[PDB]
Amino acid sequence: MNLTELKNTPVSELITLGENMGLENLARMRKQDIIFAILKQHAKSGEDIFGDGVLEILQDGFGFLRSADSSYLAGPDDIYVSPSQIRRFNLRTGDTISGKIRPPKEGERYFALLKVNEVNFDKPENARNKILFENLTPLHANSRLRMERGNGSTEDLTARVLDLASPIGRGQRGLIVAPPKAGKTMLLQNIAQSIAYNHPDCVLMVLLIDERPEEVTEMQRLVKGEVVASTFDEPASRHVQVAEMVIEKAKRLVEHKKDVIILLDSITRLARAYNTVVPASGKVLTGGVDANALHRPKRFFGAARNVEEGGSLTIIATALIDTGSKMDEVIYEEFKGTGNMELHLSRKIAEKRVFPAIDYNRSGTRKEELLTTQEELQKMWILRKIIHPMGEIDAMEFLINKLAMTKTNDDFFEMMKRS
Amino acid sequence: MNLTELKNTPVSELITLGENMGLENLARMRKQDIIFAILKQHAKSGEDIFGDGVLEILQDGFGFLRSADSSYLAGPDDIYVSPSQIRRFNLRTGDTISGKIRPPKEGERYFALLKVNEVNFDKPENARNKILFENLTPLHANSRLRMERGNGSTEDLTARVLDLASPIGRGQRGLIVAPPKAGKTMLLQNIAQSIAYNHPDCVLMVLLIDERPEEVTEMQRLVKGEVVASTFDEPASRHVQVAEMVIEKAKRLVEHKKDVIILLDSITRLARAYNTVVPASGKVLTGGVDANALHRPKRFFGAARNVEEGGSLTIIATALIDTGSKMDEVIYEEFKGTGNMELHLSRKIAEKRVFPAIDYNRSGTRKEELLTTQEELQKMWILRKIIHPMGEIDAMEFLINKLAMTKTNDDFFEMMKRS
RNA sequence: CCCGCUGCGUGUGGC
Ligand SMILES: Nc1ncnc2c1ncn2[C@@H]1O[C@H](COP(=O)(O)OP(=O)(O)O)[C@@H](O)[C@H]1O
Ligand SMILES: Nc1ncnc2c1ncn2[C@@H]1O[C@H](COP(=O)(O)OP(=O)(O)O)[C@@H](O)[C@H]1O
Ligand SMILES: Nc1ncnc2c1ncn2[C@@H]1O[C@H](COP(=O)(O)OP(=O)(O)O)[C@@H](O)[C@H]1O
Ligand code: BEF
Ligand code: BEF
Ligand SMILES: [Mg+2]
Ligand SMILES: [Mg+2]
């Protein structure tokens, strides 16, 4: 029992609940009004009411608990938190809070809360002395996020090729670059499925920025976890603040020694939104990029790291290259200077239609020896040496038609060694 | 005992110290409060507290001894030095001062220095009669900094190739120019190891401006010297302040006839920070560079020189090219006009996964006859004549698989002359 | 030969 359940419950159920116990209503107004009336009558009955939300701090000192359904923006229902509670519990923006709430008093249009009992999914006083995110000691990615599933399915081929080309570890700063219609979004979907299957302990938060609504619905339907989105019909500031809220929530989760994974549908459009919202400095680089536009995107992308104290933040963002515009090229080569994993998809392999359309020679990760073991690293070395002389197309066809009949990558390696 | 000595000890040790013979405390507050309390009680005994720092002189006349843990920035404990002491000892910004401090009394908000005992690791009676940095007569580099080792290991190979392409001397202005992912940071790490092993007498300082925090941790746990860092999380103003503090410290050390070596993880990011901080003048160069933006980067880079009076300052920095934005192109081609040593790494050799990915033909140093012997220069000329016709990837493969079987460069030259 | 001390425009986006 909490505010969220009543928010997501069907209108018929809540109208019946108000009808039998409570004053009758014919439901001539909005559902939120009926929810407010039900909350009022339940508070009058004397029963405590629960509430949940992700905290966002305002410049005055008070904060609002935004809801995930509204994609963490302001809305009609936003629990108010006083600066006194924030100071007492040392809360920061992005800290999810669950606790007892109260209906608004006179002159108040938002619910308030009197007690908290779940701060970032644990007992609240643990927030008294936790090490801050910027105070953690970062490290190179040590643990490996194996995307391989071993079921032998056709979609498992993309995960296997991902494992072979550019290994992904915990705390990786990854980029997936390709021209449009080259297989980016479906690669992200396959990555999300592999994460959900292999690594259920990780907190997967798929963030879509400046993307088509149909893809938003597809992600919400076929992804197990949390999906937040901001379609392309929304302003740039919308995308900007959604991204800030998501990254702050991820940082707060990491502060509690959690493994957090974020999949970004496109970092190029996030950089474009940041450029649009940035004040003009009078200096413009190649393309339309403002000189000071890329600081905040750099911070957002570089929030991903491997923490020695425990937990990690992985970010896998897609990007556009070879689109005929220097904006995308400069964005890619500027985020190439801060990322770790790089995966290239080429339109030539996509037109030839052999999927996944991965450019093996142009894709790799930094410090692969820290993820793969010695024998696996040597096998990867041999495979890359064999693949490199061949072109992209024939190498991809040879690899795909060479590991398809093999269930596991280890068996593929040993069969390469045998033959 | 020093103040920094109490900083470096764990909180448990200092709280036990404060509990066994000092006032009892259960440590409910921050560490700095305990440090202040124990220092005040120790001064109340009638003895003398000690401390140390690096001097930064404010525009009003007084100064503060910043600490390395705060990246030589304003922290919550900075020993105050009166203008009288500065005038007495002719102290300038960046001087490392160690001496007797006193606790803050009423009206005093930070610690204060009353007696000094060491200025730049020397008695304070030598700083009054020294020659300022700007008055030292500059000179071309004469003493060679041998990066070679007798190990024969693979990691030595890179250093060896450096000794063949661009010899490095004391007082050089180095530029490791390459696109992203070419190998600049690993090459800088190898240079740091070579400096630490071959030349332990040189003062090695590593400056990382706007780079990955994991690389900062790797430098800290790998470099045998001093590491000062400012990751991309910080703004450009912090970057420039840290840069000026480091360069002032290096200049003060050079004024005492010391060999100082500075390694810059990226001079391009420093130039970008200076461009963002500089006031607009209405004139913008191609690529988005302000017209008056590169003067201070020029001063920072040209602070490196060989001093005839004794000592030297050697700055080796990494730069960026082929990013797709002409900002980096103009920055590199402008720093090439104020440097001595250029070492180029090509992205395509890196994609071949052949390391080091040095561009031998585009790499060289100015006035190499002053750093090498006659026979060594003759052999280097012969090798360059051999290498020049062949392609860059072929050249690097030939060089690597030719000097892999020789422990030193002399054996490589002997086997090339013989065969 | 006697002297008063010291926004937009342009540029940058731009080939
Ligand atoms: N593994 C795959 N199998 C079949 N088609 C694919 C695959 N990956 C991508 N595609 C094709 O890509 C097109 C859409 O591009 P998508 O993969 O969603 O990334 P993006 O839209 O970002 O380019 C679809 O028409 C789909 O047919
Ligand atoms: N001497 C070397 N030996 C082996 N690998 C190297 C060497 N130098 C660079 N690399 C490779 O380069 C990657 C790191 O590149 P880095 O130097 O960080 O790029 P940048 O020069 O743009 O900072 C690592 O994954 C590493 O495998
Ligand atoms: N006539 C020459 N003989 C030998 N070396 C030369 C000659 N002219 C230039 N160099 C080489 O060029 C380098 C200096 O170039 P410099 O003339 O300073 O460049 P800039 O033209 O930018 O001033 C020296 O290291 C030297 O080896
Ligand atoms: F067409 Be997709 F955006 F590569
Ligand atoms: F990718 Be490197 F930092 F240029
Ligand atoms: Mg897409
Ligand atoms: Mg680097």
Residue numbers in the entry:
A (entry chain E), B (entry chain D): 1 to 419
Structure paper excerpt:
Bacterial transcription termination factor, ρ, is a hexameric, NTP-dependent 5’–3’ RNA translocase and helicase. A ρ monomer contains N-terminal (NTD) and C-terminal (CTD) domains connected by a flexible linker. The NTD comprises an N-terminal three-helix bundle and a five-stranded β-barrel, the OB-fold, that forms a primary RNA-binding site (PBS); the PBSes are located around one outer rim of the ρ hexamer. The CTDs jointly form a secondary RNA-binding site (SBS) at the center of the ρ hexamer.
We attempted to further narrow down the path of RNA along the ρ PBSes by determining a cryoEM/SPA structure of ρ in complex with a 99-nt long, natural rut RNA derived from the λ tR1 terminator, which encompasses both SBS- and PBS-binding regions. In the presence of ADP-BeF3, we obtained one reconstruction at a global resolution of 2.9 Å. In the ρ-rut RNA structure, ρ adopts a closed conformation very similar to ρ in complex with an rU7 SBS ligand and ADP-BeF3 (PDB ID: 5JJI3) and to ρ in a pre-termination complex (PDB ID: 8E6W24). Density for six nucleotides (nts) is clearly defined at the SBS in the center of the ring. Density corresponding to RNA regions at the ρ PBSes is fragmented, suggesting that corresponding RNA regions are dynamically bound and precluding their reliable modeling. Irrespectively, the reconstruction is consistent with six nts bound in an extended conformation. At the PBSes, the two 3’-most nts are accommodated at the core PBS as observed before. Density for the preceding nts is lined by ρK102, ρR105 and ρK115 on one side, and by ρD60, ρF62, ρP83, ρS84, ρQ85, ρR87, ρR88 and ρF89 on the other. Structural comparisons between our ρ-Rof and ρ-rut RNA structures showed that bound Rof would block RNA binding at the extended PBS. We surmise that RNA bound at the extended PBS supports the closed-ring interaction network by structurally stabilizing the NTD, reinforcing the sequestration of ρR128 and the repositioning of ρK130.
